């Protein structure tokens, strides 16, 4: 439906902003975790403070009113977090608000019930302790994956917004670790290579050669409800492919991907990136939230509350097993070969709601 479509466009707009902030470097975030976190924040906001968030998120208030957007994200969060057999998936977020400001009981229950949101009362006069509280909550929620989310914290800080995702899944076709090459050449520039181990399997994969956008798209299924999309642009075409990415593009690929026997070569690697979302969201329209003129009346009765920081970090491993620790010890040329040896874009999607669990660019897979 339309919400999936509107969230994917946000994902690619948010992605592009990151390409101007940090050009020619790795990008990695959970757009759905961000999109859901902002709506949640919005719930406690009033007037133009609230209005701005939903419009930066990509929604039109004439098309769909605020209550419908809430009920939609209500349903999206609930369906995602629903424990499905062979998949661990949790999209969550928290708030850390200065002890002197009392959040409303209605708001508290509403966000825990409808948005999977815990709200914490934190003392920000001890920026050291305050950091350790926050980081440990994300470290706890993500089962040790996302460590040390927040490095910097101003003495001013009044409210800190944190969003995250927990993801654990197996490949539908797991790789043979014995078939993994120890050191393969991987292009990052046009005049730099790095040694990345290269996993090797020949199996049936969905793929496409896009003649219009000048890239190869490969789909690798997880066993339950999730898939990876590897987008490999021809040389010099990385940025034009970045311009191309939209909801309209995915719909195209969904219609056109074909299954066949492929000699597949995929790098074994871990990617992580950490963001303070403020600089880009400020550019993208969310003003009044960070402002001294913030209206968060739905959240608290008493005065002086506003958003200090929105912080998010995404971590993902690509291994032989799936999204899990490897630690594993140690025929023909008439198959069409797909070899991911250059810098590529990467998408992790969830099937039933068409959400983007992860998006990013891998420029260099060795941190």
Cβ contacts of residue 105 below 8 Å, gap of 6+?
none
How would you class 178 by CB atoms within 10 Å of its CB: exposed for 0-12, middle for 13-18, buried for 19 or more? exposed
| Span of 3-11, 45-53, 117-125, 138-146 interacting with ligand T44 by CB under 6 A | 3-11
Confirm or reject binding of residue 349 to ligand T44 (CB under 6 A). Answer: yes
Contact map string, positions 192 to 231, toward ligand T44, x by CB under 6 A = -----------------------------------x----
Q: How far is the CB of 352 from ligand T44 (least distance, A)?
A: 8
What is the total count of residues that contact ligand T44 (CB under 6 A)?
12
Contact map string, positions 304 to 343, toward ligand T44, x by CB under 6 A = ----------------------------------------
Q: How far is the CB of 270 from ligand T44 (least distance, A)?
A: 24
Q: How far is the CB of 347 from ligand T44 (least distance, A)?
A: 8
d(C-alpha 346, C-alpha 349), whole Å: 10
Residue 8 vs 213, nearer CB to ligand T44: 8
Residue 2 vs 143, nearer CB to ligand T44: 2
Q: Is 351 annotated as a binding residue?
A: yes
Q: How far is the CB of 271 from ligand T44 (least distance, A)?
A: 20
What number of H helices and E strands is found in the chain? 9, 14
Collect contacts of 205-208 with beta carbons under 8 A, ≥24 apart: 205/259, 205/260, 205/262, 205/264, 205/338, 206/257, 206/258, 206/259, 207/257, 207/258, 207/260, 207/262, 207/338, 208/253, 208/256, 208/257, 208/258
Residue with tokens 């920026």: 127
Q: Is 255 annotated as a binding residue?
A: no
Nearest Cα neighbor of 341 from 257, 243, 233, 253 is 233
Residue 60 vs 191, nearer CB to ligand T44: 60
The backbone torsions φ and ψ at residue 105, rounded to the nearest 5 degrees and listed phi first, read: -65, -40
Residue 4 vs 201, nearer CB to ligand T44: 4
| Span of 72-80, 178-186, 268-276, 347-355 interacting with ligand T44 by CB under 6 A | 347-355
Residue 18 vs 253, nearer CB to ligand T44: 253
Q: How far is the CB of 246 from ligand T44 (least distance, A)?
A: 9
Residue nearest to ligand T44 (CB): 8
Residue with tokens 């995404």: 314
Contact map string, positions 234 to 263, toward ligand T44, x by CB under 6 A = -------------x--xx-xx---------
| Span of 68-76, 114-122, 346-354, 358-366 interacting with ligand T44 by CB under 6 A | 346-354
Within 10 angstroms of residue 103's Cβ, the number of other Cβ atoms is: 21
Instruction: Give the Å distances, CA to CA, from 339 to 174, 236, 348.
Output: 17, 17, 19
d(C-alpha 344, C-alpha 232), whole Å: 5
Give CA angle at 314 (309, 320), nearest 5°. Answer: 175
| Span of 1-9, 56-64, 310-318, 326-334 interacting with ligand T44 by CB under 6 A | 1-9
Strand ranges in the chain using DSSP code E only, listed in sequence order: 27-29, 87-98, 117-122, 159-169, 181-187, 193-210, 215-221, 226-233, 258-267, 269-276, 309-318, 337-339, 344-350, 355-362
- Do the beta carbons of residue 190 and residue 340 sit within 8 Å? no
Confirm or reject binding of residue 5 to ligand T44 (CB under 6 A). Answer: yes
Confirm or reject binding of residue 354 to ligand T44 (CB under 6 A). Answer: yes
Confirm or reject binding of residue 8 to ligand T44 (CB under 6 A). Answer: yes
Q: How far is the CB of 8 from ligand T44 (least distance, A)?
A: 4
Q: How far is the CB of 89 from ligand T44 (least distance, A)?
A: 14
Q: How far is the CB of 257 from ligand T44 (least distance, A)?
A: 6
Nearest Cα neighbor of 220 from 262, 178, 187, 186 is 262
Q: Which residues bind ligand T44 (CB under 6 A)?
A: 4-5, 8, 227, 247, 250-251, 253-254, 349, 351, 354
Could you list the residues known to form a binding site, using ranges. 254, 351
Could you list the residues known to form a binding site for thyroxine, using ranges. 254, 351
């Amino acid at each position: 439906y339309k919400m999936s479509s509107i969230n994917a466009d946000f994902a690619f707009n948010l992605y592009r902003r990151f390409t101007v902030e940090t050009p020619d470097k790795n990008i990695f975030f959970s757009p759905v975790s961000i999109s859901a976190a902002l709506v949640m924040l919005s719930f406690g906001a009033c007037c133009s403070t609230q209005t701005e968030i939903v419009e930066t998120l990509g929604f039109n208030l004439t098309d769909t009113p605020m209550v419908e957007i809430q009920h939609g994200f209500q349903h999206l969060i609930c369906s995602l977090n629903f424990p499905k057999k062979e998949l661990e998936l949790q999209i969550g977020n928290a708030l850390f608000i200065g002890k002197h400001l009392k959040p409303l009981a209605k708001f508290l229950n509403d966000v825990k019930t409808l948005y999977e949101t815990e709200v914490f009362s934190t003392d920000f006069s001890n920026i050291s302790a305050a950091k350790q509280e926050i980081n440990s909550h994300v470290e706890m929620q993500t089962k040790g994956k996302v460590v040390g989310l927040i490095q910097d914290l101003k003495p001013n800080t009044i409210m800190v917004l944190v969003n995250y995702i927990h993801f654990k899944a197996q490949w539908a076709n797991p790789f043979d670790p014995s078939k993994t090459e120890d050191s393969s050449s991987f292009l990052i520039d046009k005049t730099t290579t790095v040694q990345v181990p290269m996993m090797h399997q020949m199996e049936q994969y969905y793929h496409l050669v896009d003649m219009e956008l000048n890239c190869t798209v490969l789909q690798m299924d997880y066993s339950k409800n999730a898939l990876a999309l590897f987008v490999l642009p021809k040389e010099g075409q990385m940025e034009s492919v970045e311009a191309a990415m939209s909801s309209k593009t995915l719909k195209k690929w969904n219609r056109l991907l074909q299954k066949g026997w492929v000699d597949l070569f995929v790098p074994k690697f871990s990617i992580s990136a950490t963001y303070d979302l403020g600089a880009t969201l400020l550019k993208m329209g969310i003003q009044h939230a960070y402002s001294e003129n913030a209206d968060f009346s739905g959240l608290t009765e008493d005065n002086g509350l506003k958003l200090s920081n929105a912080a998010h970090k995404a971590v993902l491993h690509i291994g032989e097993k799936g999204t899990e620790a490897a630690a594993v010890p140690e025929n023909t040329f008439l198959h069409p070969i797909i070899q991911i040896d250059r810098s590529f874009m990467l998408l992790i999607l969830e099937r039933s709601t068409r959400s983007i669990l992860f998006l990013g660019k891998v420029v260099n897979p060795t941190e």
